[PDB]
Amino acid sequence: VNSFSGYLKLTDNVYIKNADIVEEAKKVKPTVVVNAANVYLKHGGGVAGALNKATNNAMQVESDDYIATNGPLKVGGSCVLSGHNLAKHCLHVVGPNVNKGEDIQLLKSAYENFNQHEVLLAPLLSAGIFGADPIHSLRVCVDTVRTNVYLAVFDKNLYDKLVSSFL
């Protein structure tokens, strides 16, 4: 038993809720919150800009030091950094950005990073401003992640759509 509430169960291990991941994170304090990161960890908008804003820019400061030391992430890759006031840890995962022409097949590789963590609060990777179809993202998620994932979907309309179309 864990502290996530109001989730609909899609599979043995995947759950989903219409929620703001920032507010979901500040209430739950999960062990891991996933950020929808880019390879530069520049948290300007979308989920990343919202998570970063909620940390009062501390996420960005930490991220800039990470990049200065290690260089950019790979598309499909990830790093574990602090969760600041939102979670114990933040798993920054780089899904492909369709609006940059990145290969959607890398979406499976991106979701594989979730398997290194027993429980995660996460957004749908490559959705929103990353330009992929969220219904496809949820499918890859279900078919790739084996650990327990709690998906927060900010938009009530898309959420209804993801549930109603789920196979």
Closest approach of ligand QJU to the CB of residue 127, in Å: 3
Contact residue for ligand QJU among 21, 87, 149, 162 (CB under 6 A): 21
- DSSP letter for 130, please: G
Residue 128 near ligand QJU by CB under 6 A: yes
Give the footprint of ligand QJU on residues 35-74 (CB under 6 A).
36, 46-47, 50
Of 7-15, 25-33, 65-73, 148-156, the window that binds ligand QJU (rule: CB under 6 A) is: 148-156
Using CB under 6 A as the binding criterion, the count of chain residues that bind ligand QJU stands at 19
For residues 74 to 113, the per-residue mask of contacts with ligand QJU, x marking binding by CB under 6 A and - elsewhere, is: ---------------------x------------------
* Cβ count within 10 A of residue 54: 19
Q: How far apart (Å, rounded) are the C-alpha atoms in residues 60 and 150? A: 24
Q: What is the 3-state secondary structure (H, E, C) of 81-119?
A: EECCCCCCEEEEECCCCHHHCCCCCHHHHHHHHHHHCCE
Residue of the chain from 114, 150, 154, 159 that contacts ligand QJU (CB under 6 A): 154
Residue 89, strand partner residues: 32, 82
Q: How many residues are listed for the chain in this entry?
A: 167
**Structure token digits, residue 36:** 């929808």
What are the residues binding ligand QJU (CB under 6 A)? 20-22, 36, 46-47, 50, 95, 123-130, 152-154
